[PDB]
Ligand binder design. Structure first.
Ligand SMILES: CN(C)C(=O)c1ccc(Nc2cc(N3CC[C@@](C#N)(C4CC4)C3=O)ccn2)nc1
Length: 273
């Protein structure tokens, strides 16, 4: 069973940084001891602590990080994605609008697929979207993901620790309800990060905090100002039509937002123009 990784064939190279609920590292996997082996990414895990594994095991698509197996405190083993996160990539290269849109498209494809499998992500930001060699998008960090039971539209969870509240729709900040439409909001914020080249001083927490204290006063204030209709600003050099898309992803009421399935055509259309 090539889903079962043996400690004895796993040799560490680099730390790769941190995901939600565990460190990630690059390992060589050399079961036949051939001196070359295979590069893999391993996340060290550990109620619902194994949910990341259970969810990702069941996902297969070109725009989601590929599950490889586990090592029996548990280790999750995934494809290594060499270029890393969009958040560290974009500030360090010049990238064309047409290509930022293409990255946007691919996030939507994967998110549409994820939604079709009845999962929500709840952690969609540029820091968690990774790039492979051909600059293909792979969505990552499934630490916060949940299954939405059949014929329900949301899931209720109060996170005990940190979560990307600056990426979260009002219904999530206020009532701890997470809809499919909530990931669409997050994707709107993510679309903003791409267009601001993930400049740190343009970043959502940067911009939101400008308009604003304590950890949870911040959240109540942020909720208040989203409900009043205030939003991140148009990125410099961002086309009008694209700003419209983001604005649509940030409708206050979740039923107004477009779906990822809706977004694919629209992004394809704007990708040429
Ligand atoms: C400074 N940088 C960016 C790096 O040194 C670097 C370069 C490549 C690379 N590839 C890679 C990274 C992950 N990671 C990073 C941690 C995470 C989790 N969970 C992030 C989603 C949150 C995850 O899946 C997974 C598979 N391949 N990673 C890092």
């Amino acid at each position: 069973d090539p889903t079962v990784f043996h400690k004895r064939y796993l040799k560490k190279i680099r730390d790769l940084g941190e995901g939600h609920f565990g460190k990630v590292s690059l390992y060589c996997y050399d079961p036949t001891n051939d001196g070359t082996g295979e590069m893999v990414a391993v996340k060290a895990l550990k109620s619902g602590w194994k949910q990341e594994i259970d969810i990702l095991r069941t996902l297969y698509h070109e725009h989601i990080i590929k599950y490889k197996g586990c090592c029996e405190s548990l280790q999750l083993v995934m494809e290594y994605v060499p270029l890393g996160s969009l958040r560290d990539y974009l500030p360090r290269h010049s990238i064309g609008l047409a290509q930022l849109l293409l990255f946007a498209q691919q996030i939507c494809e994967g998110m549409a697929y994820l939604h079709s499998q009845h999962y929500i992500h709840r952690n969609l930001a540029a820091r968690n979207v990774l790039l492979d060699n051909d600059r293909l998008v792979k969505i990552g960090d499934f630490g916060l993901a949940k299954a939405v039971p059949e014929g329900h539209e949301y899931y209720r969870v109060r996170e005990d620790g940190d979560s990307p509240v600056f990426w979260y729709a009002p219904e999530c900040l206020k009532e701890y309800k997470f809809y499919y439409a909530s990931d669409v909001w997050s994707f709107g914020v993510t679309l903003y990060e791409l267009l601001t080249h993930c400049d740190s001083s343009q970043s959502p927490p940067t911009k939101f905090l400008e308009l604003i204290a304590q950890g949870q006063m911040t959240v109540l204030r942020l909720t208040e100002l989203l409900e009043r209709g205030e939003r991140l600003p148009r990125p410099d050099k961002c086309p009008c039509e694209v700003y419209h898309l983001m604005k649509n992803c940030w409708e206050t009421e979740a039923s107004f937002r477009p779906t990822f399935e809706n977004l694919i055509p629209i992004l394809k259309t704007v990708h040429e123009k």
